[PDB]
Structure formats: C-alpha cells, structure tokens
Design an enzyme around this catalytic site. Structure first.
Site, PDB file in Angstrom:
ATOM      1  N   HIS A  42       0.804  -1.213   0.000  1.00 18.76           N
ATOM      2  CA  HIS A  42       0.000   0.000   0.000  1.00 18.76           C
ATOM      3  C   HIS A  42       0.846   1.276   0.000  1.00 18.76           C
ATOM      4  CE1 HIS A  42       0.106  -0.170   4.613  1.00 18.76           C
ATOM      5  NE2 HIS A  42       0.389   1.095   4.363  1.00 18.76           N
TER       6      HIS A  42
ATOM      7  N   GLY B 171       2.765   6.036   9.423  1.00 15.92           N
ATOM      8  CA  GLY B 171       4.130   5.868   8.994  1.00 15.92           C
ATOM      9  C   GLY B 171       4.820   4.654   9.568  1.00 15.92           C
TER      10      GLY B 171
ATOM     11  N   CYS C 205       3.980   1.521   9.166  1.00 10.49           N
ATOM     12  CA  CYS C 205       3.875   0.315   8.364  1.00 10.49           C
ATOM     13  C   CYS C 205       5.231  -0.089   7.799  1.00 10.49           C
ATOM     14  CB  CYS C 205       2.865   0.515   7.247  1.00 10.49           C
ATOM     15  SG  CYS C 205       1.154   0.520   7.919  1.00 10.49           S
TER      16      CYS C 205
END
Ligand SMILES: *C(=N)[C@H](C[C@@H]1CCNC1=O)NC(=O)[C@@H]1Cc2ccccc2CN1C(=O)[C@@H](NC(=O)C(F)(F)F)C(C)(C)C
Ligand SMILES: *C(=N)[C@H](C[C@@H]1CCNC1=O)NC(=O)[C@@H]1Cc2ccccc2CN1C(=O)[C@@H](NC(=O)C(F)(F)F)C(C)(C)C
Ligand SMILES: [K+]
Ligand SMILES: [K+]
EC number: 3.4.19.12
Lengths: 306, 306
Positions: A41, A143, A145
């Site tokens: 993503h 942030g 991830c």
C-alpha cells in the site's frame, strides 16, 4: 529475581530497516540481501484506499518511482514485483548487515518483538502476542507500516510479522513476510473488524509458574482438578481450552517448581471464580497471557543470543 | 493507536557488551574505546562477600588475571584501575562499534532501558524507572552484573546504570558509570534494604494523558483542584508531591489533549479515593508510574533515533 515484559535485542533487525517512498507515502521496508520488502500500500493514494486495484496502480510505477533510503544512502531500485500484500524491491546493493534469518508464520498464542520504526529509523522495541483473533495489541502511528516483528533463536532472526493496518478497537493487523495477512484482514479501508478475542490459557499458566519461581505463591491452593473439569471453567471465562500438548509444554516449569500442571489449573480456576481480592501477581492486578512457557524459561534461566 | 512499555533499540549497546572473567566469577563489561568498565566485585570470591577489602584483593591481580572476551575474540588487558565500585580495564583494542555516548547520573523518577546480558551476550531489553528509593524493579539473575541501562537521544547513547546487587524484596541496585551507587547501597553482603518507595505522581499523570490520547477517557470528571489540595490527597496514598516544575513538564500533553493539569489532578484524586471499580486504563487495573511525560510524547508522536 524479578519478571519483566522482555523484548529481544533489536540490533540485528535495526541494520535491516530502510525508508521506502512512492509519491506521497513514506513507510518502512526490510532490507535483506539485495531485496527490500515493504507493504504494497506504499503505492496507494488517499483517495484510492476504499478499494485499491493494486495491479493497476503498480503497472504505472517503474523502478525509479521507488525511492529507497538506508539512513543517509540512497539504494537504487533495479527491479520490483508484488507478492500477496508486499512489494519486493530488488536493489543494486546487498545489505552488508544482513543477519542469518528465516521467514516464519507464527501460530496464535505465540509472542514476538516489534521494532517500531518511522522513516526507516527505529523508535523502540516491545513484545507482543499473536492474539487468537489474529490481531496484535501494538503501538503504531501513521508511517509505522513496514515495521516488523521477530524472534531470535541462537544466531538466527526469525521474521514473522510486518505491520499494515489498524482495526477499530486500536488493535493491529499485518502479514507474514510472504505478504499473507494473519487473520481475515485485507489492505482495504473497509468495515472489517476483529473477531472476539480469548485469553491464552497456557500462557496464563506459564506466568503463574513465573510468579512462583519469583516467590509470589499466595494463589496456590491445596486442590487438584481434571483437565476436563478445568476446561469447563475456562470456557465460561473466555479462556482457550487447555490441551494435553499445552500440559506437556508446561512440563519444564512444572518440574522446576514441583507443581503439577493440573494443580496449577485448580489455582487458576479459583482465581477466575473468586478474583484476586485486591492482590497482585508479579505486580499485576490482572492475569497476564502474553508470556509463553518458552518466554518464561528464557527469562528465568538467562538464555542469550549469538 | 495503542500504548506499550517501550524500550530503546539496543543495537548501539549490544556492540559494547563483553565478558569479564576473574578466577571463578564471570560477569559483563562495557567496552567503550579502549576501556572495559565492569563491577569491581568480579575480583571477589564466595567467602569474602560479607566485607571485601577491594584494594587488597585487587593488588593481588595483574592484567593477565582479567580475561576479557568480545564474543569469540579475546581482548588483551594492558592496564587496570578501580574507580569507586567499578574497574576500568584498559585493553589493547579500541572498540570499532563504540557509539557516540555520554555517562549520565539520572534522577529518581526517570526511565531507561536495560540490556540484560549473561556471559557478554544479550538476553533481552526492557524499560525501568529509577524508583524514589533509588532501586529499580528489574529482572536479573546470577551473572547479570555489568548489564547497563541507557537512554538514546538522537545519535547519542547516555549510559546511566550498571547492575551490581539484588536487595531483599527482589529489587535491584547499581551504580552510574563512574561507579557511584544510586541510593545508600554498597557492594557488600550485608543487611541493607530499600527504603519505603513512593509512587511517581507526575508519571502517573503522563500516563493518564497517554490514556486520553488513545481514547480511554472514562476517568475524566468535570471538576478541578488546586495544587495544594491535590498534594494533600497524594500524600495520603504514598504519592510524591507534584511540583510546579512537574506541572510545566506536563504542558505539552495538556496542550495536545486540552486538559489542564489541575483538572487531570482532580480526576487522579478521584481514582485514588474511589478506585477503578473493575475498570482498566490502557489495559491495566493499576495506575502506572513508569512512563515519564517525555516517554509518553515520544511514543505518541513517533520519535526516532539516528
Ligand atoms: C502504516 N503506515 C499505517 C499504520 C496505521 C496508521 C494508524 N495506526 C496504524 O497502525 N497503515 C494504515 O494506515 C492503513 C493503510 C491502508 C492500506 C490499504 C487500504 C487502507 C489503508 C488504511 N490503513 C488503516 O490502517 C485503516 N484501518 C482500516 O481500514 C481497517 F480498520 F483495518 F479496516 C485506518 C487505521 C482507518 C487508517
Ligand atoms: C551480578 N552478577 C549479581 C546479580 C544478583 C544475583 C541474583 N540477582 C541479582 O540481581 N550480583 C550479586 O549477586 C551481588 C554481588 C556482591 C558483591 C559484593 C558483596 C556481595 C555481593 C552479593 N550480591 C547480591 O546481590 C546479594 N544481595 C545483597 O547482599 C544485598 F541485599 F544487596 F545486601 C545477594 C542477592 C543476596 C546474592
Ligand atoms: K486487480
Ligand atoms: K580497604
């Protein structure tokens, strides 16, 4: 003496964290040999979150559209591909701090350490469990991830989690390092929510043994129980069933303390039916279920890593 | 979302851990540049623990009597000296992984990470506080001495603790890196015991703010209090007095949430007088006092380290 929620030393993993930027979005990636693994993503935009068509977004990106930074040094991307819910960015430089490693898919009830990272840089490390409902009770912000979870055995880092999503109760969902989600979750902004969780019974028992080893014994009673009778009480209080494999896994702690597992179960049954009445076990007013038997033995015997 | 007892990444410290052996005893040392720092009681023997004459034991040891190992490589000792309760072993090799570092003496109420080590090798990392009674609630076994505590700011490791002793309740005592003990404790097997501890009030407040940021607000009431009236209640429940400096240190969390510190105090007073009545805050049934304001902001804003 003493007992703390203890994480693995993070050094081997710190040397693997990089930053991945694709247009607007920056998150973290894991640099092993000449591959950076990150959540797919990263290629999304704020609008297309309801239902991203990942194959369509990706075919519009070339290698140069991925900006990958290892601290101050840019890593040039020379290939890219999607595997399940992760991207593998082939880079022109093999990471010289790649440790000996394995990708593992952990089982519910197991624990691991998380190295929480922002912009490729580490923030902290903490210990978590894979809940029965396939979530983890983490601490993660925008942030985060691409942050990973892991275990260390001897000299080998076993990577088991990469962070992707936060679910409504403030709990977290992610994938193994092959990009398959734990649980039913997906990388879409939809109505998905976590199933009802349960309490990891074998782990609660492990922690009661940890209490005993440290001298906190007041909850031990003089009774015993059968496995079947114990499990009837456990069901009522939303505890997982205790299996004979669990009983055998607890063998080393039972031996050290001289307390048969079924005797410990009789003490647990009393705690569930009667409460703790203002008392604490290892400084806690609740029963703790995020220490595995192996975690307890490691901490209470001094196991180290190469 | 979420809130965990979070430790600093340990990698910079892992590269500094070595093993020190002197006769029977092995424990850990900290290798910075060409100096290894370790607890002086490495030169003791099981008999002479009641009252070691450290100067007399030491004059009988030469450089070769200290065996210092950095993983698999022996580090030759070419000088030695005693400073307070630590030894400084000059070695022939400067540590190439020495990070930017400082030795600091922390204040009671402050927190730090511990890298628990055995035989020079890391076991795990956890977060602790310097208790008001100058102890720490650690997790330490035989052989753990020489393990250090530390904070990371930007790129600089601030070493603040080295582990020496376990006191009767299972709590721990140690020195700064200049070898001065925190508290009244000494490296003798005597009757010493920890003073009565108190609860770190500013930290409890910080953690209540952490709860609010994460959406756990049920304990907020509609009342306010004065600082003096709050501190009367705090004394009764064995809480430290809250100072105006504490109030000002809480300013950033008060601003983020829009809750004046004195309003939060009125909610804390109610929790102390009435209890939680079966409810939890951030998954805990007790008030937590081992997060500082700065810890809360770091975790809830995503602060990282170079
Ligand atoms: C990673 N950087 C970030 C971590 C989140 C941010 C807040 N706390 C966290 O742990 N990941 C996201 O925000 C993801 C990314 C994503 C990919 C595809 C489609 C939609 C998203 C939005 N993300 C969510 O975590 C969202 N959660 C959900 O949609 C669901 F509850 F899981 F369904 C949301 C937290 C609402 C932004
Ligand atoms: C370090 N390797 C070890 C860490 C201890 C061992 C058990 N858990 C721990 O945290 N340090 C010791 O055992 C020290 C060393 C020492 C130096 C000089 C004189 C006496 C000792 C014995 N040690 C103690 O910690 C003892 N405690 C006390 O004597 C007192 F309570 F602090 F007074 C004891 C735990 C009883 C061995
Ligand atoms: K598609
Ligand atoms: K002397």
């Amino acid at each position: 003496s003493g007992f703390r929620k203890m994480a693995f030393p993070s050094g081997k993993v710190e040397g693997c964290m990089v930053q991945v930027t694709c247009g607007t979005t920056t998150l973290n990636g894991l640099w092993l040999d000449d591959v950076v693994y990150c959540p797919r993503h990263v290629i999304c935009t704020s609008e297309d979150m309801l239902n991203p068509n990942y194959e369509d977004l990706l075919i519009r990106k070339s290698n140069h559209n991925f900006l990958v930074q290892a601290g101050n040094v840019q890593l040039r991307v020379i290939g890219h591909s999607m595997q399940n819910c992760v991207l593998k960015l082939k880079v022109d430089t093999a990471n010289p701090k790649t440790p000996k490693y394995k990708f593992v898919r952990i089982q519910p009830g197991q624990t691991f350490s998380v190295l929480a990272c922002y912009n490729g840089s580490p923030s902290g490390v903490y210990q978590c469990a894979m809940r029965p409902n396939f979530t983890i009770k983490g601490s993660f912000l925008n942030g985060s991830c691409g942050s990973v979870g892991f275990n260390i055995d001897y000299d080998c880092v076993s990577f088991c989690y990469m962070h992707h999503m936060e679910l409504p109760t403030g709990v977290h969902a992610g994938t193994d390092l092959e990009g398959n989600f734990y649980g039913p979750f997906i990388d879409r902004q939809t109505a998905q929510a976590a199933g009802t969780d349960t309490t990891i019974t074998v782990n609660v028992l492990a922690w009661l043994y940890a209490a005993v080893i440290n001298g906190d014994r007041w909850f031990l009673n003089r009774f015993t129980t059968t496995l079947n009778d114990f499990n009837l009480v456990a069901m009522k209080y939303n505890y997982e069933p205790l299996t004979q494999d669990h009983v055998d896994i607890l063998g080393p702690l039972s031996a050290q303390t001289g307390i048969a597992v079924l005797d410990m179960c009789a003490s647990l049954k009393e705690l569930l039916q009667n409460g703790m009445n203002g008392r604490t076990i290892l400084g806690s007013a609740l029963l703790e279920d995020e220490f595995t038997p192996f975690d307890v033995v490691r901490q209470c015997s001094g196991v180290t890593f190469q």
